Design a protein around this ligand. Structure first.
Ligand SMILES: C[C@@H]1CC[C@@]2(OC1)O[C@H]1C[C@H]3[C@@H]4CC=C5C[C@@H](OCCC(CO[C@H]6O[C@H](CO)[C@@H](O[C@H]7O[C@H](CO)[C@@H](O)[C@H](O)[C@H]7O)[C@H](O)[C@H]6O)CO[C@H]6O[C@H](CO)[C@@H](O[C@H]7O[C@H](CO)[C@@H](O)[C@H](O)[C@H]7O)[C@H](O)[C@H]6O)CC[C@]5(C)[C@H]4CC[C@]3(C)[C@H]1[C@@H]2C
Ligand SMILES: C[C@@H]1CC[C@@]2(OC1)O[C@H]1C[C@H]3[C@@H]4CC=C5C[C@@H](OCCC(CO[C@H]6O[C@H](CO)[C@@H](O[C@H]7O[C@H](CO)[C@@H](O)[C@H](O)[C@H]7O)[C@H](O)[C@H]6O)CO[C@H]6O[C@H](CO)[C@@H](O[C@H]7O[C@H](CO)[C@@H](O)[C@H](O)[C@H]7O)[C@H](O)[C@H]6O)CC[C@]5(C)[C@H]4CC[C@]3(C)[C@H]1[C@@H]2C
Ligand SMILES: COC1=C(OC)C(=O)C(C/C=C(\C)CC/C=C(\C)CC/C=C(\C)CC/C=C(/C)CC/C=C(\C)CC/C=C(\C)CC/C=C(\C)CC/C=C(/C)CCC=C(C)C)=C(C)C1=O
Ligand SMILES: CCCCCCCCCCCCCCCCCC(=O)O[C@@H](COC(=O)CCCCCCCCCCCCCCC)COP(=O)(O)OC[C@H](O)CO
Ligand SMILES: CCCCCCCCCCCCCCCCCCCC(=O)O[C@H](COC(=O)CCCCCCCCCCCCCC)COP(=O)(O)OCCN
Ligand code: SF4
Lengths: 71, 43, 54, 324, 100, 98, 94, 64, 157, 174, 58
């Protein structure tokens, strides 16, 4: 019961934390897209922020670190 | 006449007999008592 | 021989009953006074017949 | 992280002092049972005896016999001493009083225990002495044999708790100390701890008078002291583990405000002291088994009983749905 | 670069096992040890892939492979022991009588 | 004025938040379930954030002292409810969950 | 999280240093017994038994009756092996 | 492909896997499921993503 | 050097205190004198209380007590055990037999004093010396150890 | 860098496994290799496997190897041989394996070149999976005994075979 | 009452254990500003990292 109390507490404040994180990531992604537009200016055939997945479904950017979340 | 053979086994191997009884209780409870408790809960 | 005596033997073997008495009377001497002599301030007893240095 | 070394030293140095005084306490209690005094000249009430013995040891010339395993011979005591030290990183003394709050702490302790055998084996083999080698082999076999029962008892506690975190194991005993329902398991654990630390009535390396040479017979000066210190630190650790698993660690005896006044570290210390006293008392009370007898006890008595307790506890908790 | 570095670690362990087979023609105990090294490298390969792919199958199989490694070493060392007992030596010239 | 919405403040107020911002929370979670893309969920996030910050300001206005003590203890014990029962009761007696 | 393992490493380094200091300051002023192999084999088997017990013990609340009986079958096989060893005299050191 | 994630949730690439499998379960020619298959493999290895980002880094190193 | 000598003497006092407070004899229990030695270690006199702990291996020993008659057959064994003792080390000769051959002096099989085989620091007279006499001899050994100035002699060498 | 350190330690320790003249020394170096492997496992976040590698590989398997090798008392004459004449055959076989097998992942798993820009801000955090995190231990235990229990039991059969074989091949009852 | 001599070394051991607990507890508290929290999981770490921003950027 003690654990469920803590876990319910985490559940009620989840949406606001997620919304904050979403706003942060969107702003950072816009900045990175402007950066890529500048760097790849004068490279023909480019498309800024092209989705590499054919389905077009959204995935977070891959990081190239095997297990970053545990450290 | 296997009723003092078990007596003799218990007298000579108390540790093995105790281990068998303890583990047998641990096996008997989920095998028999748990389905009974599950059945009484359904009704 | 009998279920009661076999049970009593099994319990005594499993519960180390006879090991308890040794622990108890070792513990009894723990609180009693000690026999050690505080040499050289205190000495052991000797008799007028003691054969020491010529 | 800059303050981490200070915490580590605040663990290691008082532990070494505690070992030095555990040796003195063993001598004192043994003497008092034997109606004598034990150390009482070197310092008041003999309280300076450990410092004098340590000073003597460091001022003793090392021997290092002309063996072909010069490196291994000196590294074996280092290995056993370091292993005795590092188990304390995960030991909690009170709520939040622990260096490493490992989620896998129980298995980590099991791993350290399993590693302890190598110092003894390497000391026996590297010493270039058939007696030391044979004694080391026998001691190693005894330790691995009783490690099985220790692991199974660990599993019994784990089934009750549902987490390998030592602090969680302590806090799971707020309702009742595990030593009450699992009292035979606690007795089994204490005996297995005696055998695992090569302590009486299982102290083969101490049986020189029985034509059984110990694994450290060729050692002098500080290698021998390292072996001794590791052994006594492991005794303190086994007492601490008995306290954590079955006597509720830092918890008070009764959940009452009168008992909650005194800090949890003091509760933990008092329980550890009780178990150390039992170590000494047992050494004072009984003769020792032969090697073959204790091996038979390890494999024929404690393993079957430990496995049976695992089965019984798990079956009972599953049946009535009392699992964590 | 993480995944290439984790994979080359296990890869050097595997190549070391292969080299130990190649370099130990008079020492079959080390040949057994080299085979364990290869098995350890494969086990590491399963664990790394499990993390990289976010999949548990690599972890289940790693545990089972550890069981196989243990049984393999037990039986192999028994066979080594009985070979030594029969011959009184472990030299390779005393285990070459079956040929042709 | 407006309390800094740190982990301590949010965790201490979590029960009030769950009782008060339930519709916004559920709507946000449904939209996240349908689409994990953060851009396609910003509106529901703003609704959630406004509800939560309004409730935070309200609770600060009603019981300032009890809220301060409860938040302070929660931060001191890293949001461990068990070590904070007294001030939790004091906070809930003056700022009822309703 | 693996954060808690870092103090263990620093602790190991410090313990090693203490060991070297203590050990280094005084430098300033053909009979094969098969029963050991057999006890090693038994320890290996029951070591793996404990290994497999750990996840089971922490997972009992989720695996329920099926997991309990599967582990029981595992133990039944291993205990038949143990009975075989017991009868054959592998556990006797006399 | 299994769906069991290493942290106790659905695996990262399992929805891609299931789309690919469901496509192949009724398309008599595997070339009709090529796009979903390469999406699954891209989720496993991120090859095209990292290649494109390396192109960006390359152009940055060229223009500096 | 008005400051170096004081620190040196303090160091030597610390070394002597450590070495007198922890004397770990190995017993060469040869004959009747070993029984009185056992009594010295027993409860009435309690050599433990002086820090004296008896060791089984010469490797962990600082002192050898020769308690009893030394025969010609045994002499090589005594010398080899003495040669395994790490420095610093001392030898106590206990009883007339070990001191000078005693009642067996004129025998064809007896070493006429263990000081023909090993250097002796203290001679404890008696046949056997009482347990208290052995304790007095051990206190004389402490007195001899307390004249050592190892650090000072090495500083000047 | 840290993986460079651990890989270098593993490389040297493994060479010592395969090249030490004394087999007891080989067993000890093998133990160093397993310690380094455990370090890598801790880097991957697999603490259960990191501990189990110590318990089983070092605590049980290496102990078995050490007991057997120590009681063998192998003389170096029985297993000595010069290895200078193997350098070429190891060179081709190693190179071919090196060129093929250290780089097999490169075409499938192309590394991300680390740039002079902070990509850490593009890490997206999903708090939903963080409400109730599972340990490596409980994630494995959720699967071993229910969904894949047959493989578990077959492994038990393998261990039973090991026990029977150990008895039948070596037992000499007094 | 002579047996009280033996209780002094045991009391010293107990005090040593109390030190190994409390000294490491107070050093951690002084450095981090609050006592160590048992059971720090992914959620708590994410909370602390986000709280650094929510505090410093205010
Ligand atoms: C019982 C017996 C006794 C014996 C025994 O057991 C048995 O005892 C056992 C005891 C064991 C030791 C226990 C413990 C460790 C520590 C571990 O070492 C941690 C290393 C990890 C953690 O390191 C950092 O982790 C976080 C950063 O990641 C830090 O967080 C910050 O950053 C956060 C984010 O901004 C902020 O939010 C936070 O606020 C902020 O604080 C955190 O502080 C810090 O710890 C991994 O880190 C690396 O990994 C990176 C990824 O690969 C590498 O990145 C690089 O490559 C990238 C491209 O790939 C490029 O993009 C990058 O630019 C480029 O740098 C890079 O090399 C490096 O970072 C190494 C293993 C070892 C020694 C064990 C050995 C084996 C034993 C001796 C066992 C032994 C067997
Ligand atoms: C031979 C020689 C002789 C001499 C010698 O050596 C040997 O002899 C040796 C013998 C040694 C003494 C032994 C013991 C102590 C006690 C210790 O003092 C208590 C430890 C502190 C923390 O630990 C507690 O707290 C834990 C958490 O609650 C308890 O856990 C609970 O909860 C768990 C979970 O539910 C359950 O599982 C547990 O069962 C349950 O108990 C844990 O048990 C308990 O110990 C006391 O804390 C307090 O101090 C705080 C300061 O900040 C104050 O905080 C306050 O102020 C904040 C700011 O505003 C606000 O935010 C806060 O809200 C607000 O509270 C406040 O006063 C109060 O908290 C002080 C050190 C001393 C004297 C040692 C000195 C040195 C020696 C004399 C040695 C000496 C050298
Ligand atoms: C008879 O059984 C016994 C033993 O085994 C034979 C003992 O070793 C011992 C004694 C062993 C010891 C006292 C080891 C104690 C070691 C320590 C407390 C740690 C080091 C202490 C020192 C004074 C060394 C100081 C070293 C330095 C470099 C100085 C700087 C600090 C006793 C008392 C004993 O009764
Ligand atoms: C040292 C102890 C030895 C113990 C030996 C005795 C027990 C050995 C195991 C024998 C098999 C089970 C016997 C127990 C009968 C009671 C089974 C029972 O109660 O039924 C449960 C189901 O029990 C089982 O089905 C488990 C069977 C265990 C598997 C035993 C193996 C049998 C053959 C397997 C074939 C695979 C090939 C073998 C490979 C070697 C009902 O559970 P549920 O359907 O309501 O929900 C499932 C669960 O609660 C949620 O996860
Ligand atoms: C608050 C105080 C807490 C104290 C905690 C620690 C307690 C003190 C522990 C130390 C006690 C003294 C230790 C020295 C004795 C060591 C020698 C042990 C020898 C031994 O194990 O003998 C075996 C029986 O004991 C055993 O088997 C031991 C295990 C007993 C477990 C009991 C198992 C069944 C219990 C009944 C449970 C039923 C209820 C649940 C359903 C049988 O071997 P043998 O060869 O000596 O045979 C001869 C029998 N005369
Ligand atoms: S001196 Fe006397 S008491 Fe001592 S051994 Fe010789 S005869 Fe026996």
């Amino acid at each position: 019961a003690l654990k469920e109390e803590k876990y319910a507490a985490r559940r009620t404040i989840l949406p606001i934390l997620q919304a904050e994180e979403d706003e942060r990531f969107v702003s950072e992604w816009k900045k990175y897209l402007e950066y890529e537009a500048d760097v790849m200016k004068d490279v023909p055939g480019w498309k800024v922020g092209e989705n590499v997945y054919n389905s077009g479904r959204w995935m977070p950017p891959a990081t190239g670190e095997l297990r970053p979340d545990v450290w | 006449p296997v009723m003092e053979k078990l007596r003799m086994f218990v007298a000579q191997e108390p540790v093995v007999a105790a281990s068998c009884l303890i583990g047998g209780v641990g096996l008997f409870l989920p095998a028999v008592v748990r389905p009974i408790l599950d059945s009484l809960e359904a009704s | 021989k009998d279920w009661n005596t076999v049970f009593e033997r099994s319990i005594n073997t499993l519960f180390l009953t006879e090991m308890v008495r040794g622990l108890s009377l070792t513990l009894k001497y723990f609180f009693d006074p000690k026999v050690t002599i505080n040499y050289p301030f205190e000495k052991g007893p000797l008799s007028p017949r003691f054969r020491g240095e010529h | 992280y800059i303050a981490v070394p200070a915490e580590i030293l605040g663990i290691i140095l008082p532990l070494l002092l505690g070992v030095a005084f555990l040796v003195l306490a063993e001598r004192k209690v043994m003497a008092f049972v034997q109606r004598r005094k034990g150390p009482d000249v070197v310092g008041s009430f003999g309280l300076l005896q450990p410092l004098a013995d340590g000073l003597k040891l460091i001022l003793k010339e090392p021997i290092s016999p002309s063996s072909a395993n010069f490196f291994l011979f000196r590294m074996a005591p280092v290995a056993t001493f370091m292993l005795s030290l590092v188990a304390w990183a995960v030991v909690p003394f009170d709520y939040g009083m622990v260096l490493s709050d490992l989620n896998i702490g129980l298995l980590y302790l099991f791993a350290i225990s399993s590693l302890g055998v190598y110092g003894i084996i390497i000391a026996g083999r590297s010493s270039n002495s058939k007696y030391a080698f044979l004694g080391a082999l026998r001691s190693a076999a005894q330790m691995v044999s009783y490690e099985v029962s220790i692991g199974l008892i660990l599993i019994t506690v784990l089934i009750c708790v549902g987490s390998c975190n030592l602090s969680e194991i302590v806090m799971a005993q707020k309702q009742i100390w595990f030593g009450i329902p699992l009292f035979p398991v606690l007795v089994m654990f204490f005996i297995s701890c005696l055998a695992e630390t090569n302590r009486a009535p299982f102290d083969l390396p101490e049986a020189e008078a029985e034509l059984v040479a110990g694994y450290n017979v060729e050692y002098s000066s500080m290698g021998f002291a390292l072996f001794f210190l590791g052994e006594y630190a492991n005794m303190i650790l086994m007492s601490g583990l008995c306290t954590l698993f079955f006597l509720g660690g830092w918890l008070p005896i009764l959940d009452l405000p009168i008992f909650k006044k005194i800090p949890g570290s003091i509760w933990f210390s008092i329980k550890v002291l009780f178990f150390l006293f039992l170590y000494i008392w047992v050494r004072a009370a009984f003769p020792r088994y032969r090697y073959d007898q204790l091996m038979g006890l390890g494999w024929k008595v404690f393993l079957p009983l430990s496995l049976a307790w695992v089965v019984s506890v798990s079956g009972l908790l599953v049946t009535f749905q009392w699992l964590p | 670069m993480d995944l290439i570095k984790y994979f080359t670690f296990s890869m050097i362990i595997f190549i070391l096992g292969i080299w130990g087979i190649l370099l130990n023609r008079r020492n079959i105990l080390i040949m057994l040890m080299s085979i364990e090294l290869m098995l350890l490298a494969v086990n590491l390969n399963f664990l790394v892939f499990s993390v990289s792919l976010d999949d548990m199958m690599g972890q289940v199989f790693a545990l089972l492979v550890l069981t196989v490694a243990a049984a393999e070493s037990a039986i192999g060392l028994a066979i080594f022991v009985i070979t030594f007992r029969v011959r009184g030596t472990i030299a390779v010239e005393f285990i070459n009588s079956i040929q042709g | 004025g407006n309390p800094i919405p740190t982990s301590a403040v949010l965790t201490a107020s979590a029960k009030h938040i769950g009782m008060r911002c339930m519709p916004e929370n559920v709507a946000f979670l449904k939209c996240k379930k349908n689409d994990p893309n953060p851009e396609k969920c910003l509106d529901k996030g703003r609704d959630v954030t406004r509800c939560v910050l309004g409730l935070l300001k309200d609770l600060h206005q009603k019981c300032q002292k009890e809220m301060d003590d409860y938040v302070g203890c929660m931060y001191y014990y890293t949001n461990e409810f068990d070590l904070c029962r007294k001030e939790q009761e004091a906070f809930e007696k003056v700022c009822p969950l309703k | 999280m693996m954060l808690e393992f870092a103090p263990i490493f620093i602790y190991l380094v410090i313990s090693l240093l203490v060991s070297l200091i203590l050990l280094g300051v005084p430098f300033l002023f053909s009979r094969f017994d098969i029963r050991f192999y057999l006890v090693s084999i038994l320890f290996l088997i029951f070591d793996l038994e404990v290994t497999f017990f750990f996840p089971w013990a922490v997972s009992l609340n989720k695996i329920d009756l099926f997991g309990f009986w599967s582990m029981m079958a595992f133990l039944f096989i291993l205990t038949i092996g143990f009975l075989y060893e017991w009868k054959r005299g592998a556990l006797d050191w006399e | 492909a299994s769906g069991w994630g290493i942290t106790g949730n659905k695996g990262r690439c399992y929805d891609f896997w299931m789309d690919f499998s469901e496509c192949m379960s009724h398309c008599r020619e595997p070339k009709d499921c090529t796009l979903l298959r390469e999406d699954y493999l891209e989720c496993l290895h991120h090859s095209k993503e990292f290649q494109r980002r390396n192109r960006i880094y390359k152009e940055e190193q060229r223009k500096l | 050097s008005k400051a170096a000598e004081f620190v040196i003497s303090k160091v030597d006092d610390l070394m002597n205190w450590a070495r007198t407070g922890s004397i770990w004899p190995m017993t060469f229990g040869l004959a009747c004198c070993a029984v009185e030695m056992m009594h010295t270690g027993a409860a009435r006199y309690d050599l433990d209380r002086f820090g004296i702990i008896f060791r089984p291996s010469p490797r962990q020993s600082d002192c050898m007590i020769v308690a009893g008659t030394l025969t010609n057959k045994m002499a090589p064994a005594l010398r080899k055990v003495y040669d395994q003792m790490p420095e610093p080390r001392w030898v106590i000769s206990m009883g007339s037999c070990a001191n000078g051959g005693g009642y067996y002096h004129y025998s064809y099989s007896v070493v006429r004093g263990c000081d023909r085989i090993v250097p002796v620091d203290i001679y404890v007279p008696g046949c056997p010396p009482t347990a208290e006499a052995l304790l007095y001899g051990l206190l004389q050994l402490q007195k001899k150890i307390n004249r050592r100035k190892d650090f000072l002699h090495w500083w000047n060498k | 860098m840290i993986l460079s350190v651990l890989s270098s330690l593993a490389l040297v320790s493994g060479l010592m496994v395969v090249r030490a003249k004394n087999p007891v020394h080989s067993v000890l170096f093998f133990i160093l290799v397993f310690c380094d492997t455990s370090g890598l496992l801790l880097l991957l976040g697999l603490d259960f496997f990191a501990m189990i590698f110590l318990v089983v590989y070092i605590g049980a398997i290496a102990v078995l190897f050490l007991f057997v090798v120590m009681m063998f008392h192998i003389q170096i004459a029985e297993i000595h041989e010069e290895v200078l004449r193997y350098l070429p055959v190891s060179g081709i076989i190693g190179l071919i394996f090196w060129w093929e097998m250290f780089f097999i992942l490169d075409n499938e798993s192309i590394p991300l070149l680390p740039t002079q820009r902070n990509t850490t801000s593009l890490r997206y955090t999903v708090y939903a999976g963080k409400v109730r995190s599972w340990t490596n231990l409980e994630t494995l235990g959720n699967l071993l005994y229910t969904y894949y229990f047959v493989w578990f039991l077959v492994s038990s059969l393998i261990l039973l075979v090991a026990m029977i074989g150990a008895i039948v091949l070596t037992m000499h009852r007094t | 009452l002579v047996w009280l001599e033996a209780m002094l070394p045991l009391g010293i051991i107990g005090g040593m254990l109390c030190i190994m607990g409390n000294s490491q507890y107070y050093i951690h508290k002084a450095y981090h500003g609050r006592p160590k929290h048992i059971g720090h999981d992914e959620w708590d770490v994410a909370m602390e990292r986000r709280d650094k921003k929510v505090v410093e950027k205010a």
